């Protein structure tokens, strides 16, 4: 028993982390086979950051322009290319620690683990969610660029995120491993704003199921709702509408507790309309939305 | 906006 | 910016995890040099678990009674002995992935990372605290026995916990790596209670500093208290008394933020007395007590 | 008390 936000074991990812230096900027890289991936803004001077022309900037760089270290060994860059907002650095050696892997694009509401790194060295691992506004509420300092987000299925590492930047609100933006940004964000040091965020309803419902499992039950009611009527209410409180797939996904938690999904929706509906008062669910007066149906199922 |  | 529950990179611990089987019980072992550590209750049958005599149970066993598997490679057991509540199984192969390590008895209030394992295989990692009542609020399922708790100091892995069991309230009990339980607990399948838990005051304040470093400032006030008057209120809300030693530990954070420890205590007093009124500190309505001053500094 |  016990509910906690877990990260996948970071070991397979640790063996892929390298240091990447270009001019005065040092950040992290991901070393898979004979390729090293890193954010393309590694090449920018402070001045370039403000209005970069990346194709212009890259052609004004060579292989020798990039210092790559795996531990104390210096790797030789033998080819470079840009793939969207990532830089691909072909090196002289295949990483012998290269795990089985995939490049996936994570969906809003889904979770992953971040191995926060500085100077090519793993500092720590934490869990977080892709927000619907396409940001993450991560923990990052200057130098963390190149840090990756991932999940592990069996022995296969699914890399889904590479860190690029922090927004004025303190939230974080980056790309997948093909260098396509999550959300409308751009690798330019100009005013960018996260869109208005919404609550991950699927996860709130998972959390309410978890609350029932641990015997926190005051919020249940016997009102009826439809998916349509619930979604109409959800959207006026900035909660994500619930899909057909989402009802499917809560199926196991519905069977285990005997509480129909739409009935939990009826409970949540009432919570939105009336508030918590000062009442708590799992110790909290706010609804948690970064704990998935898969987290809850797994941990029961 | 701050590049990390 | 951003502040997350953060576990140490778990790679070094992963290469130490093996599978240990005795009879129809399979649980996890920690393989260091040529020794494998696991909970001793692995030798118990269902009926033994009720009132075991471990010395009696262990003499009736032999080296071939234990099956140790590293990946799919079988490790030959050539020796066995009792180490309090742990078995030390001697194997003919030394762990080539053995990191620099030591065994440490963790103190109430201090934190560590749990590598939860099943069938000798790393499943997940999460940050955890030793409670003042000597339990841990973990997330563990059957088969997780032998999962360990650890910290990292530079290069050195300090093992502090090995998982044994879950108490009736859903919290967890285990030993250090010398096999001595934390707290009043015994490895017998009989109802056991922990003492009344208290809140780790030093950690709460550390987390308040982390919030300030991260831009959350609403809870700060110009009120100030004496250590004595703070403790007067602390104990009333089930908080640990704060000592001058504890005040001295918050020194660096106090200096970085420009907030006197006693001023932050006055901020905590008001939060305790008046609650939070819907507002949050680092996305939480619960006053968090599972980050040490060190965890804050290391992350910030 | 459950042994894990």
XYZ file of C-alpha atoms in Angstrom:
608
model
C 0.000 0.000 0.000
C 0.842 3.672 -0.056
C 0.575 6.128 -2.916
C 3.648 7.958 -4.241
C 4.731 9.640 -7.448
C 7.568 7.500 -8.706
C 10.235 7.994 -11.321
C 11.425 5.076 -13.433
C 14.914 3.845 -12.465
C 17.280 6.275 -14.240
C 20.213 3.858 -14.760
C 19.724 3.142 -18.450
C 19.492 6.890 -19.104
C 22.509 7.744 -16.889
C 24.830 5.794 -19.201
C 23.734 8.036 -22.128
C 24.398 11.438 -20.530
C 27.370 13.479 -21.835
C 28.800 17.000 -21.548
C 28.503 19.290 -24.605
C 30.410 22.572 -24.882
C 30.259 25.216 -27.589
C 32.082 28.484 -26.928
C 31.220 29.622 -23.405
C 28.029 27.490 -23.108
C 28.089 24.099 -21.411
C 25.036 21.836 -21.294
C 24.012 18.173 -21.563
C 23.725 15.784 -24.496
C 22.059 12.431 -25.137
C 24.415 9.814 -26.562
C 22.747 6.991 -28.493
C 24.641 4.721 -30.903
C 27.099 7.142 -32.620
C 24.842 10.213 -32.290
C 24.664 12.910 -29.606
C 21.495 15.007 -29.346
C 21.418 18.434 -27.673
C 19.428 21.683 -27.965
C 20.513 23.631 -31.039
C 20.712 26.894 -29.055
C 24.064 25.621 -27.671
C 25.575 27.446 -30.683
C 24.080 30.858 -29.843
C 25.976 33.705 -28.253
C 23.976 35.861 -25.808
C 23.360 38.218 -28.752
C 22.245 35.407 -31.090
C 19.686 34.236 -28.496
C 17.662 37.448 -29.098
C 17.130 36.927 -32.860
C 18.777 33.732 -34.066
C 18.993 32.535 -37.633
C 19.855 28.915 -36.903
C 20.807 27.832 -40.429
C 23.148 30.862 -40.661
C 24.613 30.141 -37.219
C 25.142 26.416 -37.824
C 26.988 26.839 -41.177
C 29.345 29.160 -39.214
C 30.290 26.186 -36.988
C 32.442 23.078 -37.505
C 32.807 19.654 -35.886
C 35.758 21.091 -33.849
C 33.384 23.782 -32.540
C 31.806 21.189 -30.189
C 33.612 19.704 -27.159
C 32.009 16.386 -26.126
C 33.041 14.466 -22.961
C 31.836 11.090 -21.717
C 33.297 10.987 -18.206
C 36.919 12.135 -18.548
C 37.255 10.915 -22.167
C 36.848 13.448 -25.000
C 34.717 12.203 -27.908
C 35.417 13.289 -31.491
C 32.553 14.882 -33.455
C 32.798 13.641 -37.067
C 29.577 15.122 -38.478
C 26.811 17.507 -37.496
C 23.283 18.272 -38.620
C 20.212 20.071 -37.396
C 16.937 18.246 -36.947
C 14.286 20.817 -36.105
C 15.352 22.367 -32.742
C 17.870 19.622 -31.961
C 21.471 19.259 -32.997
C 22.699 15.812 -34.029
C 26.414 15.206 -33.460
C 27.852 12.110 -35.145
C 30.796 10.850 -33.048
C 33.680 8.357 -33.556
C 32.319 5.804 -31.037
C 29.028 3.996 -30.419
C 27.892 4.234 -26.776
C 28.410 0.691 -25.445
C 25.819 1.520 -22.733
C 23.129 2.348 -25.378
C 19.863 0.819 -24.112
C 16.964 -0.465 -26.160
C 15.064 2.749 -27.014
C 12.261 4.625 -28.804
C 11.493 8.257 -29.585
C 7.875 8.930 -28.650
C 5.783 12.074 -28.502
C 4.140 12.360 -25.061
C 0.486 13.507 -24.874
C -0.977 16.190 -22.567
C -1.925 14.615 -19.231
C 0.606 11.795 -19.529
C 3.544 11.538 -17.166
C 7.267 10.935 -17.407
C 10.546 10.955 -15.434
C 13.204 13.647 -15.745
C 16.863 12.918 -15.045
C 18.072 16.440 -14.242
C 21.720 16.824 -15.260
C 24.467 19.490 -15.093
C 27.826 19.303 -16.912
C 26.917 15.837 -18.233
C 26.421 14.412 -14.735
C 23.123 13.106 -13.289
C 22.006 15.244 -10.370
C 18.553 13.725 -9.684
C 15.344 12.137 -10.884
C 11.735 13.254 -10.536
C 8.230 12.704 -11.980
C 6.078 15.269 -13.792
C 3.307 15.703 -16.357
C 2.980 17.198 -19.785
C 0.477 19.979 -19.045
C -2.414 20.609 -21.507
C -0.887 24.056 -22.279
C 2.231 22.020 -23.354
C 4.511 23.161 -20.532
C 5.940 21.096 -17.651
C 6.219 22.072 -13.990
C 9.781 20.848 -13.728
C 12.748 21.599 -11.541
C 15.563 23.111 -13.554
C 18.454 25.506 -13.184
C 20.819 27.055 -15.741
C 22.912 24.274 -17.310
C 20.114 21.689 -17.280
C 19.501 21.903 -21.064
C 19.876 18.540 -22.703
C 18.212 16.816 -19.717
C 15.709 14.264 -20.964
C 12.257 13.014 -19.984
C 11.430 9.337 -20.402
C 9.442 6.238 -19.538
C 10.616 2.619 -19.438
C 8.549 -0.251 -20.841
C 10.177 -3.586 -20.005
C 13.808 -2.960 -21.027
C 12.945 -0.220 -23.551
C 13.554 3.473 -22.827
C 11.022 5.801 -24.470
C 12.656 9.233 -24.573
C 9.926 11.850 -24.909
C 11.402 15.163 -23.755
C 14.556 17.260 -24.029
C 14.806 20.456 -21.973
C 15.432 23.799 -23.695
C 14.060 26.691 -21.617
C 12.078 28.214 -18.735
C 9.159 30.624 -19.206
C 8.447 33.809 -17.084
C 5.916 31.905 -14.916
C 8.650 29.433 -13.914
C 7.317 26.561 -16.005
C 9.409 24.732 -18.600
C 9.384 24.153 -22.322
C 11.308 21.829 -24.602
C 11.033 19.296 -27.427
C 10.715 15.642 -28.280
C 13.770 13.783 -29.592
C 13.035 14.870 -33.178
C 13.377 18.461 -31.985
C 9.744 19.486 -32.453
C 8.692 21.724 -29.563
C 5.809 20.820 -27.291
C 3.370 23.687 -27.772
C 3.733 26.889 -29.833
C 7.081 27.796 -28.243
C 10.261 28.818 -30.096
C 13.965 28.707 -29.233
C 14.303 32.501 -29.142
C 14.932 34.659 -26.052
C 11.836 36.837 -26.506
C 8.545 37.247 -24.576
C 6.680 33.947 -24.674
C 3.726 33.091 -22.509
C 2.241 29.777 -21.501
C -1.386 29.567 -22.618
C -4.011 29.384 -19.843
C -3.570 25.968 -18.281
C -6.352 23.450 -17.694
C -6.724 20.660 -15.126
C -6.076 17.053 -16.274
C -9.522 15.649 -15.480
C -8.587 12.005 -16.207
C -5.988 12.217 -13.439
C -8.231 13.994 -10.938
C -10.678 11.075 -11.355
C -7.834 8.555 -10.850
C -6.892 10.448 -7.685
C -10.505 10.353 -6.449
C -10.545 6.594 -7.053
C -7.294 6.398 -5.079
C -8.961 8.443 -2.323
C -11.859 5.937 -2.200
C -9.392 3.014 -2.118
C -7.696 4.524 0.976
C -11.177 5.020 2.519
C -11.582 8.752 1.870
C -15.251 8.688 0.733
C -17.198 11.840 1.760
C -17.339 13.243 -1.828
C -19.389 10.438 -3.390
C -23.042 11.157 -4.273
C -25.889 9.431 -6.125
C -26.486 12.104 -8.788
C -26.393 11.082 -12.453
C -24.523 12.787 -15.276
C -23.798 12.207 -18.933
C -20.403 12.570 -20.523
C -21.816 15.605 -22.383
C -23.321 17.350 -19.328
C -20.175 16.677 -17.288
C -17.796 17.962 -20.004
C -19.929 21.136 -20.339
C -19.449 21.815 -16.640
C -15.764 20.814 -16.703
C -14.889 23.316 -19.412
C -16.335 26.301 -17.542
C -13.994 25.509 -14.605
C -10.990 25.028 -16.935
C -11.050 21.266 -16.518
C -10.254 19.233 -19.635
C -13.305 17.535 -21.150
C -13.307 13.766 -20.685
C -13.087 11.547 -23.796
C -14.521 8.120 -24.579
C -10.971 6.721 -24.203
C -10.687 8.272 -20.718
C -13.854 6.460 -19.546
C -12.264 3.239 -20.909
C -9.008 3.894 -19.034
C -10.760 4.316 -15.645
C -12.489 0.937 -16.241
C -10.269 -1.085 -13.833
C -10.626 1.482 -11.010
C -14.381 1.504 -11.590
C -14.602 -2.319 -11.218
C -12.287 -2.479 -8.179
C -14.269 0.121 -6.171
C -17.714 -0.546 -7.696
C -18.120 3.151 -8.556
C -19.215 3.807 -12.147
C -17.022 6.348 -13.980
C -19.951 8.718 -14.676
C -20.884 8.492 -10.991
C -17.353 9.666 -10.061
C -17.891 12.354 -12.711
C -21.091 13.292 -10.818
C -19.002 13.519 -7.615
C -16.369 15.720 -9.333
C -19.136 17.851 -10.908
C -20.455 18.644 -7.422
C -16.927 19.432 -6.151
C -16.456 22.021 -8.918
C -19.842 23.677 -8.397
C -19.720 23.815 -4.563
C -16.021 23.728 -3.665
C -14.312 21.645 -0.995
C -15.420 23.978 1.819
C -12.411 23.276 4.043
C -12.718 19.520 3.551
C -9.768 17.383 2.544
C -9.269 14.514 0.132
C -6.107 12.477 0.894
C -5.043 15.334 3.210
C -5.461 17.998 0.509
C -7.970 20.825 -0.101
C -6.960 20.924 -3.798
C -7.471 18.181 -6.399
C -4.279 16.432 -7.605
C -3.956 16.042 -11.387
C -0.469 14.523 -11.983
C -1.214 11.041 -10.637
C -2.436 8.808 -13.482
C -4.954 5.921 -13.674
C -1.922 3.690 -14.337
C -0.200 4.959 -11.155
C -3.289 4.224 -9.041
C -3.980 0.786 -10.614
C -0.335 -0.279 -10.286
C -0.114 0.805 -6.644
C -3.197 -1.169 -5.446
C 12.417 33.560 -21.250
C 15.642 31.964 -20.009
C 17.581 29.325 -21.963
C 18.945 26.708 -19.567
C 12.955 27.404 -10.950
C 10.494 24.764 -9.778
C 10.726 22.450 -6.761
C 10.096 18.692 -7.043
C 10.392 15.561 -4.900
C 13.758 14.408 -6.125
C 15.438 11.056 -5.774
C 19.147 10.421 -6.346
C 20.139 8.837 -9.700
C 19.506 5.132 -9.066
C 21.952 3.569 -11.598
C 24.584 2.518 -9.051
C 21.961 0.758 -6.905
C 20.321 -0.951 -9.938
C 23.506 -2.887 -10.779
C 23.400 -4.297 -7.232
C 19.873 -5.691 -7.373
C 19.437 -9.485 -7.635
C 16.635 -12.044 -7.137
C 16.611 -14.320 -4.064
C 14.423 -17.422 -3.834
C 13.900 -19.785 -0.924
C 11.093 -22.334 -1.357
C 8.054 -20.627 -2.904
C 9.137 -17.099 -1.836
C 10.876 -14.730 -4.209
C 12.115 -11.312 -3.064
C 14.999 -8.922 -3.671
C 18.651 -9.077 -2.671
C 21.422 -6.472 -2.485
C 24.631 -7.807 -4.046
C 27.834 -6.122 -2.895
C 31.241 -7.672 -3.500
C 30.645 -11.414 -2.905
C 27.757 -10.975 -0.410
C 23.979 -10.898 -0.994
C 21.749 -9.242 1.646
C 18.008 -9.944 1.904
C 15.339 -10.022 4.634
C 15.626 -13.218 6.683
C 11.862 -13.923 6.568
C 12.545 -15.394 3.086
C 13.154 -18.748 4.895
C 9.679 -18.734 6.513
C 6.723 -20.779 5.331
C 3.230 -19.240 5.779
C 2.866 -21.037 9.149
C 6.419 -19.992 10.274
C 5.577 -16.287 9.704
C 3.171 -16.498 12.667
C 5.780 -17.250 15.393
C 9.166 -17.892 13.755
C 12.306 -19.105 15.425
C 14.890 -17.827 12.974
C 17.969 -19.499 14.405
C 16.063 -22.809 14.315
C 14.821 -22.092 10.784
C 18.269 -21.162 9.454
C 20.196 -24.226 10.756
C 17.600 -26.442 9.033
C 18.571 -24.812 5.688
C 21.638 -25.194 3.448
C 23.488 -23.340 0.668
C 21.304 -25.046 -1.996
C 18.146 -23.812 -0.175
C 18.817 -20.385 -1.729
C 18.567 -19.479 -5.413
C 20.258 -16.204 -6.383
C 19.826 -14.789 -9.916
C 21.587 -11.771 -11.424
C 19.780 -11.075 -14.675
C 19.354 -14.643 -15.915
C 22.822 -15.648 -14.671
C 22.609 -18.039 -11.720
C 24.836 -17.141 -8.758
C 26.134 -20.068 -6.722
C 25.616 -19.717 -2.958
C 28.707 -20.975 -1.082
C 27.935 -19.605 2.412
C 25.099 -18.351 4.623
C 24.654 -16.671 8.014
C 22.345 -14.436 10.015
C 22.971 -10.682 10.307
C 20.232 -9.710 12.771
C 17.059 -9.548 10.608
C 19.008 -10.061 7.374
C 20.601 -13.068 5.746
C 24.134 -12.692 4.431
C 24.449 -15.095 1.489
C 28.041 -15.569 0.318
C 28.355 -16.094 -3.446
C 31.306 -17.355 -5.538
C 31.154 -14.317 -7.850
C 31.975 -10.767 -6.813
C 29.632 -8.022 -8.131
C 31.618 -6.237 -10.882
C 29.128 -3.348 -10.612
C 29.897 -2.816 -6.894
C 30.054 0.919 -6.159
C 31.917 2.621 -3.366
C 29.482 2.121 -0.478
C 28.858 2.257 3.269
C 26.119 1.285 5.719
C 24.426 4.084 7.622
C 21.718 4.243 10.223
C 19.419 7.053 9.101
C 18.020 9.415 11.770
C 14.358 10.424 12.200
C 13.763 13.472 9.973
C 16.439 12.542 7.440
C 15.554 11.490 3.888
C 16.571 8.882 1.306
C 15.689 7.403 -2.084
C 13.858 4.073 -2.356
C 14.551 1.761 -5.277
C 11.452 -0.408 -5.283
C 12.120 -3.774 -6.861
C 10.149 -6.898 -7.767
C 11.655 -10.253 -8.767
C 15.159 -8.742 -8.458
C 14.276 -6.108 -11.042
C 14.296 -2.297 -10.483
C 10.679 -1.094 -10.808
C 10.676 2.549 -9.588
C 12.368 5.238 -7.527
C 10.973 7.760 -5.035
C 12.114 10.057 -2.265
C 11.177 9.119 1.282
C 11.637 10.192 4.915
C 12.333 8.307 8.118
C 9.376 9.309 10.326
C 9.922 10.379 13.987
C 7.927 7.216 14.929
C 10.521 5.138 13.000
C 8.257 4.075 10.147
C 8.320 5.152 6.543
C 5.317 6.205 4.451
C 6.301 4.218 1.408
C 4.674 2.723 -1.614
C 5.296 -1.039 -1.458
C 3.608 -4.202 -2.709
C 4.159 -7.900 -2.023
C 7.475 -8.953 -3.502
C 9.138 -5.613 -2.729
C 11.059 -7.069 0.247
C 14.769 -6.448 -0.182
C 14.228 -3.106 -1.926
C 16.678 -0.629 -0.414
C 16.861 3.005 0.670
C 19.983 5.034 -0.133
C 21.674 8.424 -0.312
C 24.666 9.504 -2.400
C 27.599 11.529 -1.006
C 29.881 12.509 -3.928
C 30.824 9.023 -5.201
C 29.701 6.944 -2.219
C 26.363 5.134 -1.994
C 25.148 5.111 1.626
C 22.638 2.267 2.108
C 20.312 2.995 5.048
C 17.148 0.936 4.587
C 16.023 -2.505 3.449
C 12.299 -3.197 3.193
C 10.695 -5.925 5.334
C 6.986 -5.355 5.934
C 3.833 -3.220 6.064
C 2.021 -2.398 9.302
C -1.816 -2.484 9.723
C -2.034 1.325 9.187
C -0.409 0.938 5.729
C 2.984 2.348 6.690
C 6.249 0.440 6.335
C 8.953 -1.056 8.533
C 12.453 -2.218 7.740
C 16.043 -2.421 8.836
C 19.393 -0.807 8.233
C 21.940 -2.944 6.353
C 23.090 -4.566 9.599
C 19.580 -5.969 9.983
C 18.492 -3.908 12.952
C 14.937 -2.626 12.571
C 14.149 1.021 12.755
C 11.800 1.361 15.729
C 10.046 -1.122 18.067
C 9.242 -3.595 15.246
C 9.869 -7.325 14.966
C 9.713 -9.587 11.900
C 6.607 -11.537 12.959
C 3.204 -11.599 11.205
C 1.372 -10.090 14.184
C -0.429 -6.732 14.558
C 2.099 -4.049 15.519
C 1.525 -0.364 16.276
C 3.942 2.515 15.835
C 4.088 5.427 18.277
C 2.122 8.597 17.467
C 3.857 10.386 14.581
C 4.957 14.025 14.744
C 5.749 16.554 11.998
C 9.410 17.193 11.075
C 9.501 20.921 11.876
C 13.052 21.461 10.551
C 11.995 20.104 7.143
C 8.776 22.178 7.019
C 10.840 25.348 7.530
C 13.373 24.190 4.929
C 10.532 23.743 2.461
C 9.300 27.259 3.336
C 12.744 28.568 2.358
C 12.525 26.578 -0.923
C 9.176 28.259 -1.659
C 10.682 31.741 -1.170
C 13.700 30.851 -3.376
C 11.055 29.854 -5.932
C 8.911 33.011 -5.759
C 6.083 31.963 -3.387
C 6.059 34.722 -0.762
C 2.412 35.242 0.326
C 2.799 33.488 3.714
C 5.660 35.730 4.884
C 4.910 38.369 7.515
C 6.773 40.877 9.685
C 5.726 39.147 12.950
C 8.551 37.539 14.917
C 8.785 35.008 17.745
C 11.294 33.506 20.172
C 12.348 29.866 19.793
C 10.537 29.122 23.056
C 7.255 30.798 22.036
C 7.415 29.035 18.661
C 7.855 25.620 20.329
C 4.971 26.455 22.642
C 2.742 26.575 19.526
C 4.622 23.866 17.565
C 3.952 21.027 20.047
C 0.265 22.040 20.251
C -0.040 21.204 16.524
C 2.016 17.979 16.916
C 5.269 19.450 15.583
C 8.720 18.489 16.802
C 10.355 21.058 19.041
C 12.953 23.128 17.200
C 16.403 23.348 18.776
C 19.252 25.859 18.399
C 21.071 23.056 16.530
C 18.152 23.000 14.063
C 18.267 26.838 13.864
C 22.017 26.641 13.038
C 21.289 24.142 10.212
C 18.849 26.605 8.544
C 21.668 29.244 8.599
C 22.793 29.060 4.907
C 19.165 29.190 3.642
C 18.426 32.094 6.017
C 21.388 33.976 4.528
C 20.496 33.226 0.881
C 16.895 34.414 1.365
C 17.494 37.245 3.866
C 14.871 35.755 6.192
C 15.731 35.160 9.861
C 14.999 31.616 11.048
C 12.798 33.062 13.830
C 10.955 35.164 11.220
C 10.212 32.023 9.162
C 9.090 30.362 12.418
C 6.654 33.278 12.950
C 5.449 32.656 9.377
C 4.939 28.967 10.275
C 3.134 29.849 13.532
C 0.593 31.959 11.600
C 0.127 29.190 8.970
C -0.472 26.691 11.769
C -2.825 29.044 13.679
C -4.781 30.407 10.686
C -4.432 27.748 7.951
C -3.926 28.705 4.305
C -7.379 29.828 3.009
C -7.362 27.949 -0.315
C -3.916 29.329 -1.314
C -0.930 27.033 -1.962
C 2.792 26.818 -1.186
C 4.642 25.215 -4.136
C 1.341 23.783 -5.440
C 0.514 22.175 -2.080
C -1.998 22.885 0.706
C -0.232 20.363 2.968
C 2.809 21.674 4.846
C 5.539 19.433 3.421
C 7.993 17.832 5.868
C 9.925 15.398 3.656
C 12.653 17.736 2.306
C 15.676 18.314 4.524
C 17.597 21.611 4.534
C 20.245 19.678 2.526
C 17.662 18.465 -0.054
C 16.606 22.094 -0.534
C 20.199 23.389 -0.966
C 21.176 20.518 -3.290
C 18.118 21.096 -5.522
C 18.182 24.922 -5.345
C 1.261 -6.900 9.538
C 2.085 -8.025 6.011
C 5.535 -9.302 5.003
C 6.425 -7.970 1.570
